[PDB]
Design a protein around this ligand. Structure first.
Ligand code: NP5
Length: 214
């Protein structure tokens, strides 16, 4: 598959740098940000399905699912929400600087809690606290499955998905964790963070665990 390359909006890049380099502690917050988005996307499919029940048939179950993958140092966060089409992947995750991107960078500088990122509607980028490379794998009812990829550089890429498993509907966040952030592949740590900061979530939050049989 041919891949297409795009430059990040100049302030989105700034922000990613202020994230990767400016904030230190409380990096566990990336999880609630990515669970929050998962819920906000599941909300939209559940709303749309009220007047278009057929929207749900491509994936009748509404859930949030986290999968630790120790071997490839990867943490994945899936939902069966509304999904994103190629154009939205492009617009919502790079080319267009969502209103508030610069505002949070300013807030942050004046002395703001990095945990307030979500209230500026930029929570997505908080993932770079624990990861240096990310794959966003989406499937909308109205397009094929695609892969959006950023390595924290200045650009990103979108490629028709012919390599990943078929998600019926929704999105997968394949975070490639930093060597010093691998505690998030642990069942207990994840399970902790989730209970402390994600109590009021309307959807099933499944944790996928792999254990050798003795
Ligand atoms: O804009 C996004 C943030 C959520 C608000 C809903 C947008 C419409 C679809 O959005 C998504 O599929 C989606 C998701 O499922 C999980 C995520 O972590 C992110 Cl970032 C997104 C993209």
């Amino acid at each position: 598959m041919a891949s297409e390359t795009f430059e990040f909006q100049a302030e989105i890049t700034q922000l990613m740098s202020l994230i990767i380099n400016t904030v230190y502690s409380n990096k566990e917050i990336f999880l609630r940000e990515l669970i929050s988005n998962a819920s906000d996307a599941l909300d939209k499919i559940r709303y749309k399905s009220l007047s278009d029940p057929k929207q749900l048939e491509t994936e009748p179950d509404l859930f949030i699912r986290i999968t630790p993958k120790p071997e490839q140092k990867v943490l994945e966060i899936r939902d069966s929400g509304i999904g994103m089409t190629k154009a939205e992947l492009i617009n919502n995750l790079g080319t267009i600087a969502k209103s508030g991107t610069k505002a949070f960078m300013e807030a942050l500088s004046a002395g703001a809690d990095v945990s307030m990122i979500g209230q500026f509607g930029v929570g997505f980028y908080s993932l770079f606290l624990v990861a240096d490379r990310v794959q966003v794998i989406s499937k909308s009812n109205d397009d094929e499955q695609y892969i959006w990829e950023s390595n924290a550089g200045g650009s990103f890429t979108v490629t028709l998905d012919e390599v990943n498993e078929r998600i019926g509907r929704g999105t997968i966040l394949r975070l490639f964790l930093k060597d010093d952030q691998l505690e998030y592949l642990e069942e207990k740590r994840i399970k902790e963070v989730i209970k402390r900061h994600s109590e009021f979530v309307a959807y099933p939050i499944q944790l996928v665990v792999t254990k050798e049989v003795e």
